[PDB]
Design a protein around this ligand. Structure first.
Ligand SMILES: Cc1cc2nc3c(=O)[nH]c(=O)nc-3n(C[C@H](O)[C@H](O)[C@H](O)COP(=O)(O)OP(=O)(O)OC[C@H]3O[C@@H](n4cnc5c(N)ncnc54)[C@H](O)[C@@H]3O)c2cc1C
Ligand SMILES: Cc1cc2nc3c(=O)[nH]c(=O)nc-3n(C[C@H](O)[C@H](O)[C@H](O)COP(=O)(O)OP(=O)(O)OC[C@H]3O[C@@H](n4cnc5c(N)ncnc54)[C@H](O)[C@@H]3O)c2cc1C
Lengths: 477, 477
């Protein structure tokens, strides 16, 4: 248990029913607090948003998209993957939300980059790119070792042990050269009898180095990205519908746009508009999970230095676009089941689905880009986003990328009402971050921006748990 | 698709209802042949065997094991994982067999003996990789900066390589490996000022001499690289699906073949079923019985064919599953699927890819081959279990010994109607392999041993398809 049972009558109003708000309400309710969550949207989960057939969104440009994905088909417009260390998985267990493997690494997906080489704009599988990169890297280090370049730092035994590893890791010849590998894959698959197949031949060392084909390999090592990774079966939002059901819809007001938040003699008073009607609620404490750039728009009595600190959390651009195909060509032709292709093009990456394997249709994430390469889509209409996504995807996966398209749906977080950012990028552990960990009398801030895991649910959930613990200790005092 | 309808009446007898035999029968039927499969066991699938509650097996030593795993819990005693290029996935699609396999995991352990302080110490894959690639990258950058590779790299190549090594190894600005977040954390980063605490790096010489990177290249195997897949509920679901499409009226289970002879009208096969000596004659035969077992049959095969069969030498491999009543690997070690790897006889410990976050699970406590399976072969199941738990506790601690519900083991060189895990051709195509691709009048051999994917279902399936195609083309003239 996070906290013991609270003694007596104590109330909290939670602004925002995203992960931080719902986790806060869930934990406070467990401990016997009166809790009310106010959520502006008509769904729980905030930046955890899963697009399905029937999903409708009007963005800040006034464009309305209606998703028409087939029944059971979806994609996560925000949060989609979870590493093994994150408390998100603990909450999936607590809430009974089934998880499955998320394909965050795949030998068969492509890399495709521009360079001053003949590989420029050429798709190469990860396994081929890795085999060549690690083949030549191993050959070079073995050559230096054999030449005696590392004799001041390696003993004879160290050199022998290193050489053995390099021959294995690089699949080197008996004489220490990278000459290609079955690890690159096959143009024709090995079968039965005298059907030996045909190994894909290697690129030259100079091509490999000058193409930068290994620029994305270290992504595999990210603490929060390395396999194994996980995701909820049927969409990430299922975590937050599960929180909703545990909290009870009697304790959550949806379509409740908070317009004011003030410390008052009785506690904290929050005004909000719901169903076009003006409402007010007072509680002993408030947990404010509204994104920090949006908090200043509220009528408030926050001190100037708090308002200034909130502005240090700069908004960030990020967006996704999903295309439903009526043929799973990536599985049938490319032998790609999940994972992502990676590119320097604006689309940045193409993410293949982790469910309905071998089915008749599926949703591909045609782009998931951030920063400059999302600013390239942000101001386009959805139709224009789609056209650009298809063109760039076809340059990676061929003309099949353009065929068998059923429908599509995009989100761009900086243009999305009640988000206006994918995640915070603090100016400059900063003084503004540290300032916003302190309560403003009876108002506490929580969210992924006030964590060391920004842009992870873990950050939101651990922030909620810390803030609930602080309120509980204060009530005890 | 494979073949397009046969004209008139034609019959085939298939010896063995493993993957090659069932695939053969399935495709022949689709083309309009009369087919009868003779299978010695009471289950379809052969070396594709899934142990669940109720499984009973008596091995060639006379020991009977009775599996008592909880409903819905199982493990694959033989085939368990499938790469994306294999036709096994295409048959899963055709048969409606749902797929979901963790073949790489940053959080599982490596544990090897060495003349270092890491000897017999468990190290996570992510820590072992970060240190290995960190120091490897530092050393290659050092050699490059020194000028050791000036005769093979240009100035611009050196700069491009240095950039890659900095990021691949997570080197400091001055080119040293000093640790990384990639190693993981002793305390997880959370919210506020809860930064967590990184795990500190091992020293260079220790890392090199420990051999903790000796298994990293497994990640790159053409048939092992992620993404990998497996059928939901067990690998044997593929072969129960074949069984149901073929029809149990066309399969005689508990049918021990004792004779196979070319005769005037085709091939006559004698077998014992229901205690009775039976005979069947068909136009053609497809013999999928493992090659070392074929010689035991009464037959009229030419001497050179009998000699060729003996060149396919049998091999030792086996597995042992333990059902735990607590998923400690998930709750304590944050391991969700994947395998720990070791030089101990157990060889590896494979964690389950289903029932994530649930209350119980089956761990494959060993999967070993060759000498390291010969260490288990002659042991009783009780002795196998004791050895598995002893060696496993040396890797995963005392928790490995607790919450044990039940267990079940297979050793393929002691298993009736297998007596081998897979073949190794002496001289490894070899002349004996080539010889056995030829029909012996109306008798065709098929199986994974007559493929370039031995010890894969793909090998058995492509062998079946090739043999069915040969028969069809011969029937067509
Ligand atoms: C593109 C993208 C990719 C991501 N990738 C991952 C990933 O793969 N895995 C992962 O774990 N996380 C990922 N995340 C991060 C994850 O979505 C966030 O960490 C999490 O949603 C943060 O929760 P929060 O409660 O702090 O904020 P939010 O989710 O933003 O919730 C804030 C809530 O406040 C509400 N609100 C705003 N204004 C008002 C108002 N005036 N009145 C009432 N309510 C209001 C909003 O509607 C919203 O529901 C991703 C996010 C994005 C957008
Ligand atoms: C330990 C182990 C691990 C494996 N790992 C993988 C993996 O992860 N993925 C993968 O794809 N493959 C794997 N395989 C390989 C896979 O199991 C085989 O490739 C496949 O089972 C071979 O099919 P087959 O039809 O050639 O032979 P078998 O499966 O051996 O079938 C032969 C059949 O002949 C029958 N038979 C024998 N004698 C008689 C007789 N006298 N009369 C009647 N019938 C008889 C047997 O009962 C059996 O059903 C593994 C196998 C083992 C044992």
């Amino acid at each position: 248990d996070l906290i013991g049972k609270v003694k007596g009558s104590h109330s909290v109003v939670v602004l925002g029913g995203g992960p931080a708000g719902l986790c806060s309400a869930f934990e406070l309710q467990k401990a016997g607090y009166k809790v009310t969550v106010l959520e502006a949207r008509t769904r729980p989960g905030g930046r955890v948003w899963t697009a399905r057939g029937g999903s409708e969104e009007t963005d800040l440009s006034g464009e309305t998209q209606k998703c028409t994905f087939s029944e059971g088909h979806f994609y996560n417009v925000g949060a989609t993957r979870i590493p093994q260390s994150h408390i998100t998985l603990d909450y999936c267990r607590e809430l009974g939300v089934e998880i499955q493997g998320f394909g965050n690494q795949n030998a068969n997906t492509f890399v495709n980059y521009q360079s001053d080489t003949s590989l420029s704009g050429q798709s190469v599988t990860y396994r081929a790119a890795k085999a060549d990169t690690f083949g030549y890297m191993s050959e070079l280090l073995k050559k230096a070792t054999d030449q005696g370049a590392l004799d001041q730092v390696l003993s004879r035994e160290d050199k022998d042990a290193l050489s053995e590893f390099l021959s294995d890791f690089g699949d080197l010849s008996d004489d220490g050269r990278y000459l290609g590998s079955s690890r690159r894959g096959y143009d024709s698959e090995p079968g039965a009898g005298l059907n030996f197949g045909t190994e894909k031949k290697p690129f030259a060392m100079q091509e490999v180095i000058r193409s930068g084909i290994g620029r994305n390999f270290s992504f595999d090592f990210g603490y929060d990205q390395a396999m194994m990774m996980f995701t909820p079966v049927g969409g990430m939002d299922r975590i937050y519908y599960a929180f909703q059901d545990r909290i009870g819809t009697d304790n959550i007001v949806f379509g409740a746009e908070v317009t004011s938040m003030k410390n008052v003699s009785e506690g904290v008073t929050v005004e909000y508009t719901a169903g076009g009607s003006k409402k007010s609620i007072t509680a002993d404490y408030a947990i404010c999970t509204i994104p920090p750039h949006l908090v200043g728009r509220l009528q408030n009595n926050l001190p100037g230095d708090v308002l200034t600190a909130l502005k240090a959390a700069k908004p960030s651009s990020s967006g996704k676009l999903g295309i439903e195909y009526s043929r799973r060509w990536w599985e049938t032709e490319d032998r790609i089941y999940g994972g992502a292709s990676n590119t320097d093009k604006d689309i940045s990456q193409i993410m293949f689905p982790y469910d309905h394997y071998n089915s008749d249709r599926g949703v591909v994430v045609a782009y998931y880009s951030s920063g400059k390469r999302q600013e390239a889509f942000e101001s386009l209409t959805h139709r224009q986003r789609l056209a650009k996504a298809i063109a760039e995807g076809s340059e990676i996966h061929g003309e099949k990328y353009t065929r068998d398209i059923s429908s599509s749906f995009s989100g761009s977080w900086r243009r999305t009402k009640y988000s206006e950012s994918a995640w915070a990028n603090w100016a400059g552990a900063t003084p503004e971050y540290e300032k916003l960990l302190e309560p403003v009398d009876k108002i506490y801030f929580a969210g992924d921006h006030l964590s060391n895991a920004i842009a992870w649910q873990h950050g939101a959930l651990t922030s909620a748990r810390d803030v609930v613990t602080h309120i509980h200790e204060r009530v005890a005092q």
